[PDB]
Amino acid sequence: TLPCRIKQIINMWQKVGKAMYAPPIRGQIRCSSNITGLLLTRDGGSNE
Amino acid sequence: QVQLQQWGGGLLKPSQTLSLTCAVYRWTFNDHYWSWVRQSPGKGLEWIGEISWGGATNYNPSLKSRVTMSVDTSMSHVSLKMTSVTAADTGVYYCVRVGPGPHMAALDYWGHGSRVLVSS
Amino acid sequence: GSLAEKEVVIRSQNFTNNAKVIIVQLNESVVINCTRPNNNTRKSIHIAP
Amino acid sequence: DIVMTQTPLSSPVTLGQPASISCGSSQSLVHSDGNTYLSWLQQRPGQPPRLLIYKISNRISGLPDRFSGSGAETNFTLKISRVEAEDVGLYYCVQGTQFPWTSGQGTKVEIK
Numbered sequence: 001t002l003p004c005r006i007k008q009i010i011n012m013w014q015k016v017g018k019a020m021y022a023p024p025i026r027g028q029i030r031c032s033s034n035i036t037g038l039l040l041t042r043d044g045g046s047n048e
Numbered sequence: 049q050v051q052l053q054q055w056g057g058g059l060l061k062p063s064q065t066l067s068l069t070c071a072v073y074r075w076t077f078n079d080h081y082w083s084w085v086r087q088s089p090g091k092g093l094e095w096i097g098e099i100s101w102g103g104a105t106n107y108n109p110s111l112k113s114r115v116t117m118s119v120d121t122s123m124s125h126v127s128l129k130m131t132s133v134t135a136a137d138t139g140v141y142y143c144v145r146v147g148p149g150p151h152m153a154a155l156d157y158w159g160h161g162s163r164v165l166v167s168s
Numbered sequence: 169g170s171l172a173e174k175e176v177v178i179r180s181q182n183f184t185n186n187a188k189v190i191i192v193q194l195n196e197s198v199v200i201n202c203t204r205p206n207n208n209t210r211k212s213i214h215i216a217p
Numbered sequence: 218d219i220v221m222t223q224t225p226l227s228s229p230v231t232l233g234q235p236a237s238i239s240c241g242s243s244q245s246l247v248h249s250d251g252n253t254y255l256s257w258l259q260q261r262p263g264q265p266p267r268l269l270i271y272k273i274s275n276r277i278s279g280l281p282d283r284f285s286g287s288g289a290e291t292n293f294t295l296k297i298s299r300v301e302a303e304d305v306g307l308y309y310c311v312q313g314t315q316f317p318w319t320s321g322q323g324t325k326v327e328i329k
């Protein structure tokens with residue numbers, strides 16, 4: 001499992017100066033989705 | 049460790065509609081399917097139907113024209129609606145967890161059972 | 169997203185450029201189940217007209 | 218529209234004496250995957266039915282070692298190696314394999 005935190009004020013797209021508040025759902029939310037790909041970076045080479 | 053709380057109409061007049069609800073306290077509705085089983089000892093345990101998260105259902109064909117099932121996922125509720133109730137529908141109505149065929153093909157976590165009487 | 173056909177692909181822009189993203193498309197798929205196991209209620213507060 | 222019937226209506230057994238419940242189906246209980254499915258439940262007087270044995274002979278963890286079973290197609294049996302007072306109640310032979318599921322009438326195991 002991945003422990004998860006919940007957040008309501010979202011600084012969408014880093015548009016600093018504006019933010020969205022997400023009102024709460026009625027309750028008991030469960031969802032599922034498909035993982036189809038990953039965004040990865042490689043550690044850059046060090047000065048070794 | 050799945051729990052169930054159930055309640056509903058335990059007394060109906062003939063030709064009325066039965067409404068029974070079970071609350072699920074641990075999971076979603078596609079982890080296992082929920083089904084309704086009615087005890088009426090001459091027939092043992094009679095299957096009424098089962099319903100999944102997606103609203104997919106399988107009904108006992110003899111009740112196809114009388115029974116409706118639905119799931120309210122936000123309230124974690126399994127709901128059975130049976131129209132035109134008769135004396136033959138008197139019995140104990142259980143919500144049961146249905147495991148996958150390939151896993152166990154078995155019925156567990158039975159609720160205590162709603163006691164439903166149909167009478168004048 | 170769409171799934172990789174046949175097998176996994178990497179598709180980086182430049183592997184020798186350390187400041188780059190690697191966009192990996194996976195074969196088949198992985199299913200993830202997310203829950204917020206809390207039963208809430210709603211309030212509505214009149215804050216301004 | 219498969220009919221499941223249990224052979225005994227009841228079976229008084231003294232304590233420590235073995236007992237068995239045979240049952241069967243009007244149609245072989247063989248699924249599309251080639252497996253045979255049936256299940257056994259037991260109900261106590263103030264309790265809902267509960268599972269004891271799944272598929273034909275598989276034990277649930279926590280089941281007493283006293284319980285076992287076997288069978289195929291249309292002819293199945295639940296067995297108790299020694300019947301204890303705690304094993305008293307209604308045993309049900311459940312169809313398992315097809316959607317319009319039925320079960321037998323309930324066999325009452327009693328102490329003789």
Ligand SMILES: *[C@@H]1O[C@H](CO)[C@@H](O[C@@H]2O[C@H](CO)[C@@H](O[C@@H]3O[C@H](CO[C@H]4O[C@H](CO)[C@@H](O)[C@H](O)[C@@H]4O)[C@@H](O)[C@H](O[C@H]4O[C@H](CO)[C@@H](O)[C@H](O)[C@@H]4O)[C@@H]3O)[C@H](O)[C@H]2NC(C)=O)[C@H](O)[C@H]1NC(C)=O
Nearest residue numbers: 001030049050074075076079156157201202203277278279
């Ligand atoms: C995300 O993923 C996690 C990780 O899997 C899920 O959490 C698990 O949920 C299951 C289901 O409730 C838990 O499984 C159960 O564990 C019980 C063990 O606890 C008792 O016994 C121990 C001693 O062994 C005591 O110390 C403890 O206090 C308890 O008394 C088992 O007993 C349960 O099985 C029983 O019922 C079945 C029903 O058919 C019988 O077949 C069994 O024989 C037995 O009688 C059951 O196995 C599991 O422990 C949880 N894991 C963790 C790490 O917490 C999340 O639910 C999931 N979330 C989502 C959204 O998917």
Ligand SMILES: *[C@@H]1O[C@H](CO)[C@@H](O[C@@H]2O[C@H](CO)[C@@H](O[C@@H]3O[C@H](CO[C@H]4O[C@H](CO)[C@@H](O)[C@H](O)[C@@H]4O)[C@@H](O)[C@H](O[C@H]4O[C@H](CO)[C@@H](O)[C@H](O)[C@@H]4O)[C@@H]3O)[C@H](O)[C@H]2NC(C)=O)[C@H](O)[C@H]1NC(C)=O
Nearest residue numbers: 025026030031032033034100101102103104119121122169
């Ligand atoms: C793409 O990724 C998202 C996550 O980012 C996945 O997660 C959610 O998946 C669900 C299911 O596909 C999305 O849709 C919601 O389904 C709820 C359950 O529907 C039942 O009832 C309908 C009746 O027509 C049946 O067809 C269905 O099979 C179920 O039995 C609905 O209750 C939701 O309703 C919305 O509108 C009502 C209006 O009254 C609101 O009250 C609800 O709160 C809600 O807004 C909805 O239809 C859900 O949208 C996905 N989440 C997000 C954020 O998008 C997807 O599954 C995944 N898809 C794929 C193909 O991979």
Ligand SMILES: *[C@@H]1O[C@H](CO)[C@@H](O[C@@H]2O[C@H](CO)[C@@H](O[C@@H]3O[C@H](CO[C@H]4O[C@H](CO)[C@@H](O)[C@H](O)[C@@H]4O)[C@@H](O)[C@H](O)[C@@H]3O)[C@H](O)[C@H]2NC(C)=O)[C@H](O)[C@H]1NC(C)=O
Nearest residue numbers: 027028053054055056071072073122123124125162207208
């Ligand atoms: C999340 O919140 C939901 C509400 O927003 C919850 O749903 C509610 O659940 C209660 C459960 O009690 C229903 O209240 C009443 O329940 C009684 C039944 O209780 C009595 O009888 C039983 C035997 O059948 C006995 O065991 C009990 O101890 C009591 O003596 C009914 O008779 C009443 O008619 C009524 O249903 C609420 O009605 C229901 N709300 C809604 C909108 O349906 C939900 O349970 C919460 N938690 C979750 C999903 O985890």
Ligand SMILES: *[C@@H]1O[C@H](CO)[C@@H](O[C@@H]2O[C@H](CO)[C@@H](O)[C@H](O)[C@H]2NC(C)=O)[C@H](O)[C@H]1NC(C)=O
Nearest residue numbers: 031032033034035102169171196197198199200
């Ligand atoms: C996750 O992937 C599965 C499998 O690809 C999707 O479900 C099925 O997809 C096939 C096509 O490959 C369709 O023919 C089936 O009809 C689909 N079945 C269902 C129930 O949708 C699935 O939709 C994808 N997304 C999620 C959230 O599960």
